[PDB]
Each structure stands twice: as structure tokens, then as C-alpha cells.
Amino acid sequence: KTVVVTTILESPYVMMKKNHEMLEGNERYEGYCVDLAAEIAKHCGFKYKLTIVGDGKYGARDADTKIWNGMVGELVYGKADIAIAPLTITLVREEVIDFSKPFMSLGISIMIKKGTPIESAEDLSKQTEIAYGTLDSGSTKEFFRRSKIAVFDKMWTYMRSAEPSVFVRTAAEGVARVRKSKGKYAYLLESTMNEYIEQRKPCDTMKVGGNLDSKGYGIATPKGSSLGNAVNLAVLKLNEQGLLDKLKNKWWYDKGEC
Amino acid sequence: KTVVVTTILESPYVMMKKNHEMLEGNERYEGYCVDLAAEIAKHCGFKYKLTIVGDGKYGARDADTKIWNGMVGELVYGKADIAIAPLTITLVREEVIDFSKPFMSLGISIMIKKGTPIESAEDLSKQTEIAYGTLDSGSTKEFFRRSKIAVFDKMWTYMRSAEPSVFVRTAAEGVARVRKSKGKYAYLLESTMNEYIEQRKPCDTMKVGGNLDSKGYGIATPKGSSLGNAVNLAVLKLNEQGLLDKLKNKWWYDKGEC
Lengths: 258, 258
Ligand SMILES: N[C@@H](CCC(=O)O)C(=O)O
Ligand SMILES: N[C@@H](CCC(=O)O)C(=O)O
What we know:
The structure is a homodimer. The first copy, chain A, has helices at about 30-45, 70-75, 90-95, 120-125, 140-145, 150-160, 170-180, 190-200, 225-240, 245-250, and strands at about 5, 15, 30, 50, 80-85, 95-100, 105, 110-115, 130-135, 185-190, 205-210, 215, 220. By secondary structure, the first copy, chain A, is α/β, with parallel strands linked by helices. Chain A has 2 domains: about 1-105 and about 215-255, D-Maltodextrin-Binding Protein, domain 2 (3-Layer(aba) Sandwich), CATH 3.40.190.10; about 105-215, Periplasmic binding protein-like II (D-Maltodextrin-Binding Protein, domain 2, 3-Layer(aba) Sandwich), CATH 3.40.190. The termini of chain A are far apart. The structure holds glutamic acid (2 copies). One glutamic acid binds next to helix 5 and strand 10 of chain A.
């Protein structure tokens, strides 16, 4: 059986190549997770098809209907065999799907337009001139929704009722909104993505403050899938061989424009 | 059944309390992993006994006899039910025991006495005046032994044949050897431990350079143990609630003397 890989368009993990219109199948895409999929496939000995998640989302469970969306839902409902993506390992996801040991570490962070008078999450929470938000249907939004920490709770109370809406549908929309809002929008996103964009044209954004948490992305499979074991071993081996570090360098530091 | 916890004496993870001679059972010990054991036990609903690993080691497999020593061996040979320790998740360990998702991130790093003319691993490898080494029977030594990276391979060729021996039996011996050798010994140890000691009296050591790798410590159980699932969920929950971050702060930043 050809392994159906679910993944998500997200720089520098999975990106349409320049001439994608003329390209076929897996060849349409490039990035860290494109390279990683190839290495995992080589180590586990499977053939695979990269497919972009149908709804464009990471994964969240609707509070009323209890249905999972995003790449999580594709795995839960048997629409994909494996997810190879910047997908955050979280408790509520761990309950419904299997995860590899992490292939990359990150924490939630703040992106500002250069020159925005904000140095921390505490600064954000203590003012209203600079709007701030996050991604729909992902781990960063859930973090704020669930936080009992005073500063993060204050931020969520603001965010969930802010008008016009402070939430975005894709990280790319979040980044454009920081860029275009002249310092009146700050975006809460994972350090990995924040640090990537800080090194890309037009070099107009920066990460401020430390990370708000510490977590990891894992390769995900349906609960109890036979692929799980081999893939976990593959990630550990690829880490230990220095390949994950070589890929990080390829897609972040070598992609630097600033 | 009372859960037999194997762990290792290592600051600030597990340490004899000041008045330990007069103290009984679990009360003899304090530290990050002492606190963490208590939280995991509370979430999983078990009673437990902390025991210090009989041989004082993390875990390695003898190349001739193929026997596992350290906390890894206690789990493999059925002498402990769970290991709660700064135990590095590695491929060869993953093959023989179960690991939680990580509870802490780290990478191998260099400790120097203040003022030692060394800024990196490349600096170390390109000279012989300053001896350097690492811990027996742990992941840092294995990293060098297995490295195909030129700089790390050069370091290992030096280390494995250096006289007098550059290896130490405990990290505490490694740290004392840096302190006493007047800048002629540098110690290769995990960033977590290096950063702890940098903030302790007599404030005479420092971490130089970036980390050489990126990995994680996991709670370990015998392969297929029924405890595994609950403990993994507990670690993810404790991370998400901010408790792991609160413990890090308790045992590192609040323990600061420098
Ligand atoms: N990695 C996140 C998506 C990005 C975000 O939430 O900021 C997730 O898996 O949900
Ligand atoms: N955490 C390491 C021990 C310390 C070291 O090797 O530097 C291990 O699990 O083997």
C-alpha cells in the first residue's frame, strides 16, 4: 500500500516549488518536511504520496460536535496513513493518535513589526493599542484557551472577544497581518516559524522575548498503526546521525536573506 | 505493588538532603526528579520507592558481553519498574526499553574553568594542551564514539587513547576535575548540568559554545510495561500545566548563587 502522507503548506516545512504548475505528485513540493518524509520513507522502506491537508488545518476538536479537523482528523478518520508536518505533540492529540519522539523543539513566541514597543507577553497583556492573536485550530490557540497562568489568561480573555477578529486561518495570513498593520498587530506563533521569517525579506519582523513554553513536533500515525514503531526509530536515528540538524540548517540558516 | 523507581545521584535532579543521615526512605532525597516522581505518582495513582541505581550509571551495553549496566540495565533485567532521572532518549536505549515523550531538552556542551582559551569544540579538537573528556556509560560518550562528523571524530580519537584517562565515573568528578585542573581540563556534559553548575559557588566555570546536538530526557519503563501509557500522559499534562517549567525554575534559577 502506498503510504498517504498528510501535511500542510507552511514555510519552510512544505512549500510549492517555483515551477509547481508544471510538476507532478511529490515533485510539486519542497521543504524540511518534504526532505524528512523522503528520509523516513527510505529508512522504513515504504512508497508514499504527499497530500496537502484538505481543510488547511493542524487539528482541533470542535467543542460541540467533538469532530477532529485538520491533519489530526485525517489520521483519526482514516483519510491519511501518517502526518509529516510541524505538528505539535499535545496531550489531547496524544489521546487520539500516535506520535514519534520529537524531531524539532519549539515554544510559543511573539512576532512584531520592527520598532513595535513590545518586549514580552506581559507587555502585550497590559495594553490594547497593539492588537494580538493567533492561528485557528492549532496548539498555540489551545495553549491560551487552557492557560491558568495570569498573564496568558488575561491575553486569552482579550483575544477571544476582540473585534475585528484577531485570529487568522494560516500562519502566512498572521505574518502578512503583522507586516501590513504598521506595528498595530503582533502575532503569537511558534519560535521555529518566527525565527524563519525573521531571516526573510523584507526583514521587517522580529521575535521578541523568550518562549512561553517548551514542546516538540512529532510524526503522527493513527492510534495503533504498525508504521509507528519504525518511524519513531527512524527519527531517533536521523537525529543521532546529524541529518535533522543538517535539514534545519538547509531550510533556516541557508535560506537567510537578512 | 509498590513501584520501584530507579534514579541516579545528579544535581539538581536527585541530591541527598542536608540531614539525610537521619532521614528515612524517599525523605532522604531532594531535587527536580524527586519532585517529578511525586507528580507522576499522583497522576498515575501509584505508591513508590526511590532507589539509587546500584552501579551509579546511566546505561550502556558492553561491546563484548552485551550486558546493559546502569538504570537501563535495572529496567532490562527487571530490577526497577520505572526510571525517573536525567536519562537521555537514544535509539539503542529505545530498542530495549520504553520512553515517555521528553520532560526536558538538552544538548551536549563544553564546560571550562573561567579564562580557558576555548570557545568551541573545534578549538578543543585543534590542540592538546587542554585535555578534555566525558562521562563513562552515558549518552555523551556514545555520541563521540559514533560520530561521523569530522570535528567530533577527531575529538573521540584523542579521547579514547588519552593518558592519564580523560573519562570520569560521575558528572560530579568531571566538574571537580575542571575546577581543580587550573584550565587544563574541559568537560563534555549536557547543557542542563553545565548551566546548573555555572550558577553555583564558587562560580568558577562556564558553558562555552552552542550545543553540539539536540535531544531529550524521558521517563523510562521496561519494554511493554503497563505503566508506560499513564506516565507519558502525565508528562504531557505536567508540561502543559506549566509544572515542568515551575520545577526547572525551582531547581536552576532559584538555586543561583553567582
Ligand atoms: N504546530 C501547531 C500549529 C501552529 C500554531 O498553532 O501556532 C500545531 O500543531 O497545532
Ligand atoms: N543523560 C546522560 C548522562 C550524562 C552524559 O552522558 O553526559 C545519559 O542518559 O546517558
